Design a protein around this ligand. Structure first.
Ligand SMILES: Nc1ncnc2c1ncn2[C@@H]1O[C@H](COP(=O)(O)OP(=O)(O)O)[C@@H](O)[C@H]1O
Lengths: 149, 39, 384, 447
């Protein structure tokens, strides 16, 4: 129970054990291997984890990644830009240009993205070079943007 | 495009469900009797 | 049976195919798990050995008993059809869901243990008041007024038409509609359309039928009508001739006025009592509402008030063109001539005139109806 | 003639193709011309899913590469990606390749990179990088590859500037990940370390434990260490392990470390490795203090912590390999296990041949303890996930035959098959031969 409590408070809420990336399309082999090893070790709790091999839990090191969406300027410096965060919606088969996110709340700089939450830029000033806003995203200033005073 | 492909498959599964449930025994509607898997 | 109620897809999307494949896989896995039981340890036929053993265990001769109480733990208390109270227990096939007083419990013949339940197909009160077939044609056969046709529709059918419109407004259908009008106004004709259009169960109650001869009976009849209608299904029960509550006095009933009063109080309780009657609607009509008990009409027991006046001089035209649709009448006469014959010709008057004209044409076996037949029918109808 | 006519024609064409493929005697050109016209009509009217379905039922998916426009590629490619999830191995592979071709024709290199990563083919990634002329896009692709955990050594033919090559190599090495995590922690004000007691919120449970003697169980201390390591991972500072000795006592900070026993000491040491996650410079310096301990368990834990620290971060100096290779040969089973696990964790999915050569001889040593060989198999699987290297699979299989029936009863015997499967993660059809080979294993393990 103490191990479970520690896992729940991993990184104080900043790190996750998601083996998938980019809208669950890419499976990371390292994180999956670590998680599978941890589960196979847990299969025989008394002998493996409660025995002499408490350290098998350190295979979980492969599966932990941060919940950070940091927008970066061309000069590789962090940039705070408002971002809309919400649950992703399957836009396949929908006529028109449907929004990919359910939500209107705007969050600036590094929004803690939860499992299933997708991010779209709230400002047209910057064109995101990444079709999926996750982890490091390099933002390019839009040359066509005119500040409407 | 395969309008008849899916309807026929669904109907086959629905018919087979009863064709297999009748092999254990739920039929023979009684007049106040419980399930053979109840007594 | 009720394996999966998810049909929301309603298209050729891959989700419907995936759900069907998962269901088929689960069914196949269950069938495979079940098959091995007989393959490894059948130990019996499982088809007729069980049924034969059940028949030979439970008393072969099963009697007609009557459950009167409830004993969950392998026991039950009933009275023998001869009269002797019994302590018969519960058997394996008990399926104890009909454990209510009155349902006959069938006991064994050897040890008289509960063998079978008693399927009930009687409902005497409901049957002596259940409408089997549609009375008349669609609402178009009523004709002329339709001031309540929309109102009565909203009161009864509209709740059953698509009960989200009243749901989206945040309200429940009106409590009740009482159709009061002049004698022979066609109130019964309104119930005719209500039944021909109705969708749920409908019960017909003769107005005098609530007053019985034995003291205390009338309240029992009212409570039984309420139980039957409510316990049966969503219903629209019309107790016609409500004026008969105290208007007519008969020597058959032992009680005097304090019996009609008790029956009316019981009816009021059954309409707005101390429980949830469920989804039950009431539509009653009367021709003399001046004497009806005031309490039985307060908003909350009978909500919608509908008044039916005599057919209008403009409505009389539709009434006549309706009640004489299939008559092979000769063009000798014009209906408008008799349209104003009676200063207060009610709806029943037109039907009576048409019937009398048809009969008169019949006496001579003629093929069509002449003006003289209508003239002779008019006097015989209004004048008597 | 209207859209309904086109749709019914598409369905009937699918049926005709299905039945003609079984006949093998009808000319195809006449059907192909009509199919091309139908595809063009569907593309012009944004009825892309119908065109994709028709071409799928015709199996002539190559025609998509000619009728995709700059306004039609997004929906079409999304449909192909969605279908691929329903398509099985061989069909999905061809579909993904055609989607990659559409993407390269449409000049959206990020989606092409994602599709190629799904295909696990480095040649397509190299082609994508070569076709790219934008430095910022290359940097973003390097970030994506670092996230996916794939090492892509940029060849000299890819970039003409040495400094830019070094910059993207650092980006791939996830050097800036620690800086980003620290910046995020500063932004949210989550720097303050939380003790395990704060999570335990013991004040809320004291309603019934006022009569319990304070017996500090070793297992409770180990749980506290694990929770402390989990909560304060990557923050660089801890109140229990690295907290300043600011209380009237000149006693080594290792007071809590020595309270644990053997494997407990190893776990406490590995907690330090977690706490300095992704921080090679300070992590190595802090673990150097514990490398000097006379306890073999502490040394093994320090090695495992070193392996943890460099997890996901690669340094050109390769401190992990140089440090751990010296401890791999040591006779002590605990130190050997720690070094092997550190090498496996630090070099996961790296496909380094030097590690293969250094680890394979250990697998063949009959004098090694079951723990050592099982962890060696796990580390080899972790290093070679998805590579399908026949040599490592053969080595693990050889190790599996050489086991007596008694060793098969221990739970640790269940980990060697786990490692062998890890070698084959994500590659469907290549595993049938290995399953056939494994059918020769003993019945108790075979299944
Ligand atoms: N269009 C009509 N409007 C009104 N009453 C009509 C109409 N057509 C026929 N009727 C007559 O109405 C009567 C329906 O019974 P009703 O008038 O309610 O009787 P009561 O008022 O005595 O209970 C029948 O005699 C029927 O022939």
């Amino acid at each position: 129970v103490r191990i479970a409590q520690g896992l729940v408070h991993m990184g104080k809420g900043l790190l996750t054990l998601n083996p998938y990336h980019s809208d669950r399309f890419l499976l990371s082999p390292s994180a999956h291997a670590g998680l599978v090893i941890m589960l196979h070790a847990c299969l025989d709790m008394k002998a493996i984890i409660l025995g002499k091999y408490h350290y098998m839990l350190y295979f979980l090191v492969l599966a932990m990644q941060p919940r950070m969406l940091l927008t970066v300027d061309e000069n590789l410096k962090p940039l705070s830009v408002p971002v809309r965060v919400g649950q992703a919606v399957d836009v396949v088969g929908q006529a028109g240009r449907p929004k990919t996110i359910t939500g209107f709340q705007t969050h600036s700089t590094p929004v803690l993205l939860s499992a299933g939450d997708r991010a779209e830029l709230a400002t047209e000033k910057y064109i995101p070079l990444s079709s999926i806003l996750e982890g490091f995203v390099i933002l390019k200033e839009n040359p066509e943007y005119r500040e409407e005073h | 495009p395969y309008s008849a492909s899916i309807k026929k498959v669904e109907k086959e599964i629905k018919d087979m469900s009863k064709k297999v449930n009748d092999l254990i025994g739920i039929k023979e509607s009684d007049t106040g009797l419980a399930a053979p898997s109840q007594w | 049976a009720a394996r999966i109620p998810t049909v929301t897809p309603l298209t050729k999307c891959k989700l419907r195919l995936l759900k069907l494949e998962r269901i088929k896989d689960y069914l196949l896995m269950e069938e495979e798990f079940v098959a091995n039981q007989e393959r490894l340890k059948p130990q019996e036929e499982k088809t007729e050995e069980d049924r034969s053993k059940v028949d030979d265990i439970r008393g072969s001769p099963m009697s007609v008993g009557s459950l009167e109480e409830l004993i969950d733990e392998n026991h039950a208390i009933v009275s023998s059809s001869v009269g002797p109270e019994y302590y018969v227990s519960i058997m394996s096939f008990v399926d104890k869901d009909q454990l209510e007083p009155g349902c006959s419990i069938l006991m064994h013949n050897k040890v008289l243990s509960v063998v079978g339940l008693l399927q009930d197909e009687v409902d005497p009160m409901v049957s002596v008041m259940k409408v089997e077939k549609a009375p008349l044609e669609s609402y178009a056969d009523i004709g002329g007024l339709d001031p309540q046709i929309q109102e009565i529709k909203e009161a009864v059918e509209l709740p059953l038409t698509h009960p989200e419109l009243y749901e989206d407004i945040g309200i429940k259908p009106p409590k009740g509609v009482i159709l009061y009008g002049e004698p022979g106004t066609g109130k019964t004709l309104l119930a005719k359309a209500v039944a021909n259009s109705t969708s749920a169960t409908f019960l017909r109650v003769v107005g005098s039928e609530l007053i019985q001869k034995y003291l205390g009976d009338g309240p029992k009849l009212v409570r039984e009508l309420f139980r039957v209608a409510d316990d049966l299904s969503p219903s629209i029960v019309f107790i016609d001739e409500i004026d008969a509550v105290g208007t007519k006095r008969y020597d058959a009933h032992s009680g005097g006025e304090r019996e009609i009063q008790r029956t009316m109080l019981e009816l009021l309780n059954q309409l707005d009592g101390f429980d949830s009657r469920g989804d039950v609607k009431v539509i009653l009509a009367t021709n003399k509402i001046e004497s009806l008990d005031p309490a039985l009409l307060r908003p909350g027991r009978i909500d919608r008030k509908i008044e039916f006046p005599l057919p209008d001089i403009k409505t009389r035209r539709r009434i006549f063109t309706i009640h004489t649709s299939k008559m092979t009448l000769s063009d000798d006469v014009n209906l408008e001539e008799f349209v104003m014959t009676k200063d207060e010709f009610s709806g029943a008057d037109i039907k009576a005139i048409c019937t009398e004209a048809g009969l008169l044409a019949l006496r001579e076996r003629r093929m069509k109806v002449t003006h003289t037949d209508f003239k002779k029918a008019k006097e015989k109808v209004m004048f008597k | 003639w209207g859209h309904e006519y086109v749709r019914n024609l598409a369905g009937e064409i699918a049926q005709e193709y299905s039945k003609q493929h079984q006949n093998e005697e009808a000319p195809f050109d006449d059907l192909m011309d009509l199919v091309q016209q139908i595809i063009a009509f569907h593309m012009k009217h944004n009825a892309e899913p119908e065109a994709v379905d028709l071409l799928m039922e015709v199996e002539d998916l190559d025609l998509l590469q000619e009728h995709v426009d700059e306004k039609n590629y997004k929906r079409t490619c999304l449909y192909l990606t969605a279908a691929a999830k329903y398509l099985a191995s061989p069909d999905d592979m061809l579909v993904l390749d055609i989607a990659h071709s559409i993407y390269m024709k449409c000049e959206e290199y990020p989606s092409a990179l994602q599709v190629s990563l799904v295909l696990d083919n480095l040649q397509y990634v190299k082609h994508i990088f070569t076709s790219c002329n934008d430095l910022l896009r290359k940097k973003q692709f390097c970030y994506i590859l670092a996230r996916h955990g794939v090492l892509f050594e940029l060849d000299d033919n890819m970039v003409l500037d040495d400094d830019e090559r070094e910059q993207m190599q650092d980006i791939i090495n996830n050097y800036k990940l620690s800086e980003g995590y620290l910046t995020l922690a500063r932004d949210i004000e989550v720097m303050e370390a939380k003790s395990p007691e704060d999570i335990y919120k013991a004040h809320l449970l004291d309603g019934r434990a006022s009569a319990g003697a304070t017996v500090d169980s070793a297992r409770q201390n180990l749980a506290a260490t694990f929770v402390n390591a989990f909560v304060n991972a990557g923050f660089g500072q801890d109140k229990l392990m690295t907290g300043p000795a600011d209380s009237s006592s000149g006693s080594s900070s290792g007071n809590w470390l020595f309270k644990n026993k053997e494997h407990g000491k190893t776990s406490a040491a590995a907690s330090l490795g977690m706490i300095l996650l992704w921080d090679v410079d300070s992590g190595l310096a802090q673990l150097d203090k514990y490398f000097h301990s006379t306890d073999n368990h502490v040394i093994a834990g320090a090695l495992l912590g070193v392996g943890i620290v460099n997890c996901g971060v690669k340094n050109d100096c390769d401190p992990a390999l140089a440090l751990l290779s010296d401890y791999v040969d040591k006779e002590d089973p605990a130190i050997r296990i720690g070094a092997i696990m550190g090498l496996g964790i630090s070099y996961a999915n790296t496909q380094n041949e030097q590690l293969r050569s250094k680890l394979t001889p250990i697998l063949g040593d009959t004098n090694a303890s079951l723990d050592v060989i099982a962890f060696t198999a796990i580390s080899l699987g972790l290093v070679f996930v998805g590579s399908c290297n026949e040599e490592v699979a053969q080595a693990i299989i050889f190790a599996l035959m050489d086991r007596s029936e008694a060793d098969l009863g221990e739970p640790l015997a269940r980990l060697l098959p786990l490692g062998l499967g890890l070698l084959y993660l994500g590659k469907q059809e290549s595993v049938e031969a290995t399953a056939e080979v494994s059918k020769t294993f003993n019945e108790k393990i075979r299944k």
